[PDB]
């Protein structure tokens, strides 16, 4: 259809100089044209697959995404046809002219990480995305198979392995594969004739003699299994055996977790700016992790005591919180502590809380201080370092590098996906958000880390129809700053999806009566239904018996709570059916956060404009999870629902919590909740970009539920089941420790290739991050 | 760690050998290398030294002893290219193993008071080297092509995937739309194996002298385009060499074949700084041996390219461009004209491009140390002009010196062309401790830019040409020029852990020469230019003092002690003038004639100016009038040639008193004329001259011994005039053997082929080092370059 | 093929080192002694020998530097004088560094090896007289007698040149 394409490409040029997204890159062009389409044909689907089109007057550039992880970039002359393939860097020039009127300096930096990753071949199959440890096992398995040069690393790894001066695994008496091989079967003979329950103390004598140190297991049954595992690996390595063995070797004893930004505490915090599911996730996590860390250490017949430190910022003037104390024990843990260290400058300690977008100038000193502090606290150096978010990943990287430790990173969110076009428009946003700093560190720690943990597949490769969070970092550009040609790869074996959960002490079904905490009911009923208007709650509910549309979240632009309210306000029918209760912001105090402040004013005006009094109850931040668990359950009592109208949501812990509680959930389809929920089954999806539609849908849920009461239960049980499968903390802790073994080892084998990457990254941090970071204005007390 | 053991010997020689460790720590807080680390306590000690045993190694290999905390940071060099550094305590028993990047850390604590930052940049190129293995063997230093050949010869041997590149290479190969070697017809090795088979039988039958035009018809049929040879005999050999690589590659063949493939057609040569001209320039600031080298080089090169093109059966016409700056205001020169034809060449042209800013072009001359902010825009522009002049793209880019290597890299990268660099000198060796003391020197010499650019270029380039072995690995006793860039630090800026490895296969030694029509033995009377003897006699023995010459020579009949050079601190002319002035015996035996500096005009170069003040002052101090003649720059080489020979008539000598000299063309010229030469032992001339045979060495740091060594020489020559003739013939022979232009081009062209082919196979391995370098330039050089103040017109 | 397989390969080079170390005739050690257990010591020793020899007068007999060479692990057969021993040590150093076919051959061909030789000619009347022309007696017999004579001259030489 030579006379046809020219048309859509015409309609495209009609909008002139611009780029538009895949919704429009089609939804205007294709449909808005006459029946002249007559295209269900093969050309079409370049459009259907286009993630974005960049239009400059003669030219249209295309980014095509046939399958997750697979990208093609093209150019098309809007007249004359002539389709021509372009390299990513050249598709990026297109964006750059679109903003600066010219491309980036001929000699300005292109970041290309691809040539540094080549050590392992990359999986091309959808199934290995997020599954990288699986892939890397098969690789190490094969590599190890009857290759002495390849098997040596395993022997040395085990021979050097020790903790805090106690030798483990093999002694120095085992210098080679023959002696190892011979000794291992010697031991195996012996153990075969012992009673399974024999303790390691009995035969400990023999082992020491033949070079076998502690850590093979607690009893003779377990030392035997592990030994046999090693025999097999030396003999005929297969992936499963390799993984079991590596996950079994005692390694993680001390763990250090980085979470500098926000108010990190166990109470009186949640909902404050920059304080949210990351504090929630980390706390649940260290708990689960300590449990497993203990069983493993016990099972391997070791008596060591673990330590887990959560490194965060010391906020001296945070009041009503514990953020001012240097060490704080984590609730229900013998070994987990929060360790606080202050930001400081030449002038000395910095007192006032600082926004996450502003911490950059302070992070490098933080690292050095953090290092000195955990040296006092830890017995031996860290066996694992987990960075969280950006400031977290950045510092985690520097410490890992400094201390020589296995590093993992968890994003918890990626702003580039939260703030559309913040890469291309970065300059007008920088004074406020400093994205040039963040993106830089995002890219740095993303690559520098030994492996990566995500909570969804969406986080990596997104969906079939849409781009993932890390995926969107593969190729992008910051005009006038630098260009990322290939910055990350969704197939990188380093990615692992390990899904978190909600603490199941706090969140359970609303139908377990013995379990419900009734003593909170007086407080909740006041919270929800009372006639008083104060800084704790605004407006009032006229009709107490209606079902509740409940939401709770940090208060800011992206969470789009002001949107949800307007949807509700506009929609009379929903208003008749259910009362909107929003929890966000702490109005008890003066708001020090820009977005929070902005969103508050928006709230107030929405109240007046839509006359929200009597249908709308605006509650301040509920900072106690225990009463929060019961608050969720209370909403269920009313046959209400949880809605999450975020423009973008990286994961959505509250979405998991609500479901865990039995509460039917309606969540944004942008980001993680798109994976978490199965439309019509475990909950529903709504589009934050179409709000009125969202509301109508909710109206509809309630109407159906009114006529048929069991519809509410289908969904309730649908989510209950779903959460039972994909999201729980049980396997998380064990998966994580296993990865630390596999990746811990793999980094010895691959070490020589990561050298080139080491230096690349060093020079990127030094010559790019530091200078950007210093440019960020310091706080003033 | 062999050198930490023989030093452990304080258990034997102790109460004596911990003295030298005293007289050192007794100077304090500094670096003293070699002559000071040596001519210190050992010579200045007492016979209770008696260290002539096993200890005499670790001091004889140091290269530096840096006074320090109650600590001594020292270094040791067992063999060129192998590194041991020590740090010991005086009285504290602090002796510590020293592993690199740690030893540098100690050099930083000796300036900043603490080491560099924490996460402050470390530069390590070592990991980006891993493609080929390194020669560990001394012979391969500066020989790298010989090593790369054997690596390729092997990698090529019976490997399918491995030979493909060679086919693809010869398949794509074309010039300005003409296809050469293999056409597109041949898609695989089997077809090529066969097509080559067929070709051979046919040609074996034809008579040796059959022109390619005859069988051109047949060839085009089977896939064989032009470039194999002009006649059948040649095409035959060539075809046989290729068959051979396909079967049993050996290094000698691989090189020869790659050598002959017609490749280099358009050469582009970078020389931005200075006044680059063929007349009225030499002796000016920044204008010197590099200009002479390049002009001699291109002429030589053009000839070889012509006969290589002819032999290979091609009529393509070569072009060689010399890029340099357009100085619109240098008057009395051609430096203001865009295009200039080089003397005695058909195809070599000088191409001048102006520096500029957004405010328009920059007219004033600028010191070579200050050009940095200008170079990147220069590159863009130069690209544009040479695109205009050149037919097709550059087949080779040669960078020269520091600014020149910076640019030639950017072009090479931009245009995707094989690149060679020639340093012509490296300032870090010439300006001692300029690395560690860089911060105080910066506003004058801007060393942060220069070093950065030097490191960038060394690693960016495809191959490197040096004029001597010493320029790379130095000697047994002393460290080499490039070598000294392996590990160093600029405290506060960055720290170079592994910057270069003297064993790198990219180092190739190709020794330049002196133009034979200009410089030849003073004895060939038929050739002597007597037309000049009036000018020259006025120059030397004239009665007048002016801007052309200062003081006067009372005695017209003495042998002349002669030197000529650009005037700057390092050339150390002020040094020689003093040595001569203090030594009465030398003054009686010879007249001193120093040519340097141009006093006809006011001088705009800082060092030139400073040097004149010293000259002026010495003349008065040592009352030099009547024994001394200070002559201004001689910009015409033809007469320069006759001047050298004239000096021979007086039976004088040539002296080169540099604190450091990278090569010393004047040394070569002097000997080529037959003038017995005394030259600085620091740098290149150590290698050129063979002491007591082809000439003599002197140490600029002991000048009074130098002046006397010379007095000795003139004395012997007065007793035995045959002694002069002996050194003269020795020099003449040394030149005829090692330094000449004839083989240069062949070597250079051959190299371009081998390294050209190579860079296709190694394409992927280098991809990382390529991004590392891209960033280094963008994030390191640029900020530094924009830092440098712009010249103001 | 050997030149290419030998280029920077450990498991490859050992065979050549094992060869020279095992090499002996009539109860005398030749080339390398048992003092050299690995390429590092060999590499180090050769280099060590080279520095020494490059110093001496070319025509210096092996017996002079013999004592020292025995110290560092070098047995007889490298050559009869400094010059010869030098080229030879330089040859092997090269096989360890950058093996080429011409070097490899030259070295292997130089190492003193062939001393005793056994030639088989069972059939015919094999003799130096009164035979040629008998059944089965002819060109083979002639060839062999010329061969040995020519062979013996070359061996006495190679033996003497290798000291
Ligand atoms: O006023 C509030 C708002 C948030 N939360 C808790 O904070 C977490 C929010 O996590 P989510 O991942 O859903 O949002 P994030 O803040 O991480 O973007 C959930 O555990 C909520 O129960 C809270 O306790 N009080
Ligand atoms: O007044 C002068 C001074 C310099 N030269 C020439 O400049 C070159 C200097 O080269 P050399 O390597 O010796 O010193 P450089 O200047 O390169 O450092 C030689 O060819 C000299 O003949 C000259 O012709 N007249
Ligand atoms: O009566 C005879 C017959 C043969 N020959 C020698 O035997 C050899 C014959 O060898 P040739 O290779 O020619 O034939 P062959 O015997 O090997 O088959 C030659 O040297 C002859 O001179 C000889 O001397 N007298
Ligand atoms: O932008 C996402 C934000 O949400 C959090 O999870 C809240 O703690 C943090 O990771 C980040 O501040
Ligand atoms: O540094 C020495 C200087 O002298 C030159 O030879 C001048 O032609 C150049 O190499 C350099 O500018
Ligand atoms: O086949 C030829 C015959 O003649 C010989 O040369 C013997 O003189 C042998 O080779 C064989 O017996
Ligand atoms: K161990
Ligand atoms: K071709
Ligand atoms: K032997």
Curated annotation (Swiss-Prot), chain C:
Q: How does it assemble?
A: Homotetramer.
- Which biotechnological applications are listed for this entry? A one-pot system for efficient enzymatic production of a wide range of glucosides couples the activities of two recombinant enzymes, UDP-glucose: curcumin glucosyltransferase from Catharanthus roseus (CaUGT2) and sucrose synthase from Arabidopsis thaliana (AtSUS1). UDP, a product inhibitor of UDP-glucosyltransferase, was removed from the system and used for regeneration of UDP-glucose by the second enzyme, AtSUS1. The productivity was increased several-fold and UDP-glucose initially added to the reaction mixture could be reduced to one-tenth of the normal level.
Q: What does the entry say induces or represses the expression of this protein?
A: By cold, drought and anaerobic stress. By sugar or osmoticum. By anoxia in the roots (at protein level). Up-regulated by NUC/IDD8.
Q: Which organism is it from?
A: Arabidopsis thaliana
Protein name according to UniProt: Sucrose synthase 1
Give the highest taxon in the source lineage: Eukaryota
Q: In which tissues is it expressed?
A: Expressed in the phloem of leaves and in roots. Detected in the whole plant but more precisely confined to the vasculature in cotyledons, mature leaves and siliques.
Describe what happens without this gene: No visible phenotype.
Q: What is the lineage of its organism?
A: Eukaryota, Viridiplantae, Streptophyta, Embryophyta, Tracheophyta
Question: Which protein family is it in?
Answer: Belongs to the glycosyltransferase 1 family. Plant sucrose synthase subfamily.
What's this protein's function? Answer: Sucrose-cleaving enzyme that provides UDP-glucose and fructose for various metabolic pathways.
**Parent-record interval covered:** 165 to 327 of 808
